[PDB]
Amino acid sequence: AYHIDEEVGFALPNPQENLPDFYNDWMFIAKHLPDLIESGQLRERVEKLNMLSIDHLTDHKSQRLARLVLGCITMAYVWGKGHGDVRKVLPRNIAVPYCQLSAALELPPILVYADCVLANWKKKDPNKPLTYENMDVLFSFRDGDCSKGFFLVSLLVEIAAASAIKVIPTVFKAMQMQERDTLLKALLEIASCLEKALQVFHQIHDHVNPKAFFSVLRIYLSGWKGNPQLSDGLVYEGFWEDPKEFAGGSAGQSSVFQCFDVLLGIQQTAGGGHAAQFLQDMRRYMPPAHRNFLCSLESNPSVREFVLSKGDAGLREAYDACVKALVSLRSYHLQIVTKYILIPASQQGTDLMNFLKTVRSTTEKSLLKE
Numbered sequence: 028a029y030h031i032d033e034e035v036g037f038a039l040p041n042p043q044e045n046l047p048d049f050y051n052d053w054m055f056i057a058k059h060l061p062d063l064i065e066s067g068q069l070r071e072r073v074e075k076l077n078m079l080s081i082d083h084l085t086d087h088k089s090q091r092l093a094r095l096v097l098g099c100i101t102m103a104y105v106w107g108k109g110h111g112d113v114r115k116v117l118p119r120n121i122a123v124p125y126c127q128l129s130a131a132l133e134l135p136p137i138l139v140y141a142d143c144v145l146a147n148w149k150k151k152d153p154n155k156p157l158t159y160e161n162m163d164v165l166f167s168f169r170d171g172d173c174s175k176g177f178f179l180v181s182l183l184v185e186i187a188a189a190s191a192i193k194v195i196p197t198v199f200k201a202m203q204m205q206e207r208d209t210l211l212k213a214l215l216e217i218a219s220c221l222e223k224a225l226q227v228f229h230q231i232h233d234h235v236n237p238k239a240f241f242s243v244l245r246i247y248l249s250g251w252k253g254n255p256q257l258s259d260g261l262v263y264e265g266f267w268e269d270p271k272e273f274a275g276g277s278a279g280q281s282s283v284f285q286c287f288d289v290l291l292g293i294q295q296t297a298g299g300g301h302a303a304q305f306l307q308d309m310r311r312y313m314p315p316a317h318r319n320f321l322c323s324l325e326s327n328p329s330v331r332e333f334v335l336s337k338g339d340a341g342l343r344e345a346y347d348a349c350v351k352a353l354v355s356l357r358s359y360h361l362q363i364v365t366k367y368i369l370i371p372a373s374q375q376g377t378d379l380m381n382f383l384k385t386v387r388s389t390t391e392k393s394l395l396k397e
């Protein structure tokens with residue numbers, strides 16, 4: 028069904044918090060990364076784990092939790108305290124089950140958005156709503172890392188986007204039914220929800236401190252693709268013989284922007300030399316069912332062409348409201364990357380800026396006007 032929820036969208040609805048007692052040894056380490064890292068006992072605990080079979084993970088929610096658990100342990104093992112003391116070999120007894128589970132779930136054996144954000148959360152009270160005050164994350168890395176604020180605000184933007192995502196079938200049906208008003212309603216509804224998502228994005232400032240993000244959390248989200256600290260990638264002991272590179276790119280692995288890029292025929296899949304290659308690569312790091320969803324949307328008739336073919340200024344204005352909301356979102360995201368990467372980096376990206384500025388202006392160049 029593309030694993031897309033009416034309420035939470037690309038987020039994993041109501042994730043599992045507990046594994047079977049079989050996996051308690053995994054569970055304990057993941058639940059205690061702040062103390063084990065700080066006290067310098069983490070790597071020993073990982074290095075003294077026994078081989079635990081994944082055959083006792085009986086369903087998707089259990090596999091997603093195990094993947095989040097092993098991904099957090101792996102990031103902590105590789106990066107340690109976060110200050111250059113690195114491990115380049117992931118011990119056999121983590122690496123083999125982590126890589127087996129990853130293959131089953133068709134995701135790379137590294138921490139991704141779909142683990143640390145889409146699966147990493149709970150309601151404090153199951154009867155209060157999906158708001159920040161009623162929610163928590165399941166795992167953090169270090170005390171003060173602001174992982175609660177970063178993951179939960181990302182999740183809440185994701186949940187806000189769900190309201191626009193569930194309208195997408197109405198769009199294609201209305202094109203196909205030849206239902207002009209239904210299509211116009213739907214596009215205005217999508218834009219309205221995307222605007223609401225932009226409002227939710229503002230909570231980022233209330234809960235994430237630029238020093239903590241840039242200097243702590245960013246470290247544990249860092250990968251080994253093009254990383255000088257791990258120039259040949261990571262050795263997954265006992266599974267592949269030579270090291271492999273995978274990006275640690277959690278923020279950029281949301282499907283939300285690409286979801287509406289593709290819906291509105293904005294051309295970034297194919298296009299820019301280095302911008303389109305980056306956007307296509309980050310798809311490798313999305314759950315397969317979401318990869319599938321983005322592809323099926325590309326195969327559908329073009330909404331942008333349909334609107335263009337109609338000589339209908341009302342349609343063109345609803346379409347442009349969607350494109351505007353997507354520009355607003357990337358423009359605000361530009362501001363945040365300035366606040367949370369660029370300024371702290373200088374207090375010690377021009378390629379990073381150019382990538383984001385490019386995707387925004389390509390989105391901006393898509394407005395119809397006429």
Ligand code: HEM
Nearest residue numbers: 180181184276278279280281284285357363364367368386
């Ligand atoms: C909170 C919700 C967020 C969402 C939904 C989101 C979404 C995205 C998306 C879709 C991209 C791909 C570029 C594009 O499509 O325009 C991207 C890139 C990026 N975002 Fe975010 N983002 C969020 C928050 C953040 C935050 C708080 C930071 C803090 C610095 C950040 C840092 C980055 C970086 C560095 C990139 C470039 C890819 C990379 O090098 O990792 N993002 N983001």
Ligand SMILES: Nc1ccccc1C(=O)C[C@H](N)C(=O)O
Nearest residue numbers: 057058059060163164165166167
């Ligand atoms: N801060 C942590 C550090 C390490 C492991 C878990 C956490 C949590 O966030 C626990 C959360 N209160 C929960 O409801 O599971």
